[PDB]
Design a protein around this ligand. Sequence first.
Ligand code: CA
Ligand code: CA
Ligand code: NA
Length: 434
Amino acid sequence: TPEDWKALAADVRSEFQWAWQGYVAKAWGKDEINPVSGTSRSFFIEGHDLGLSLVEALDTLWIMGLDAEFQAGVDWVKANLSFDVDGNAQVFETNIRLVGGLLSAHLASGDPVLLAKARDLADRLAKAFEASPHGLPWRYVNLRTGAVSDPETNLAEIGTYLSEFGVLSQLTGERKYFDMAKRAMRHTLDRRSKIGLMAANIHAMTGAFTSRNASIDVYADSFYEYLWDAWALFGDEDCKRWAVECVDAQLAHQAKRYDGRLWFPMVDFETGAVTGTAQSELAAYYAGLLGQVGRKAQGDDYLASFTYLQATFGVIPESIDVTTGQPRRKHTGLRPEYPDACLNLWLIDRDPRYRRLAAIHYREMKATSRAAFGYTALKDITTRPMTQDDNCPGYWWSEQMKYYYLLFSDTPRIDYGQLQLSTEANVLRGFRKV
Ligand SMILES: [Ca+2]
Ligand SMILES: [Ca+2]
Ligand code: NA
């Protein structure tokens, strides 16, 4: 019997609403729910929660037509959320989760307060960029005082701002945000090796690389997304060029086959010698990026490596050894990158294969991660049954339930031709208001 995609979408929505009810009951205004114990935890600043999961959920709720829930969340933000806090926030996570989550909720609703708050937060983050003579952000900033800490940063944490900051520039009229984000990316691109790669680790004050490892994976990942995304969102010609050049260099020097499967291990950024054998589950975003930049066959080949992991292990292992294709770790982070890739590739030509694969992933999530008050990360994927930890990461609220719903629902609330998603799946273009 053919899959009833609309029924599956309705199931995703039902499960999301059920999870939201758990959040309201156990973690209202708090950063994350721990859905096994039915408690909450902080994310950015211990003991000074910022409603993280609530903010992350907002655009998802609106897209699903969970309007009462959306408005309850928006109304909480408007009454309660502020960033004048004497504590250190990680600049990267704060931008993609809170600035981006407020922006997508603003674009869905039109509510000016959500933009005001996004902009206030971005101005606090800007101090981290201003503290570097290169415009490379320090990793942490005190939200009240502007004091910075830890300049030993990485491509992802210097280069995952241009989508949110560029949208701020469009909405506010002030070019400073776009300019600040782009300058940091240009810094590392200008320091590409002769083979077109950047090392993943960089110092905000010296402006120099602090390792020799080029990566598509953790430390680097979303830098490469945001090059393409800035072309798509802003028509930036430099970013269009850079996106394709960077991916070309990765395909030339990092694409390696092991046991017939495509992987992208770390390599020396100048010599191309392989320098690692690990691949994170988090690398699966790259299958979608490959399609976006005009390398779809390569993207499908890379997706197939993760499809192998899903078919073999049920849940994709958090990290694997590329030389054996086996897990390196047994726990998980309830990770969204497989349906991320499926949605991004499906947006190209609507091939139902991607729906098939994402449905496996959703059903596996239901079979493994469901807990009393929501969905949780896993302790051990190798035992039967798989054992659970006790945490619903904030990104779950923005990412995989949205990906599944967008893949299955054909919702009239999104213009699928104009849809743009941040690395946190915040919708930054494509809302069709009712
Ligand atoms: Ca991401
Ligand atoms: Ca992306
Ligand atoms: Na969101």
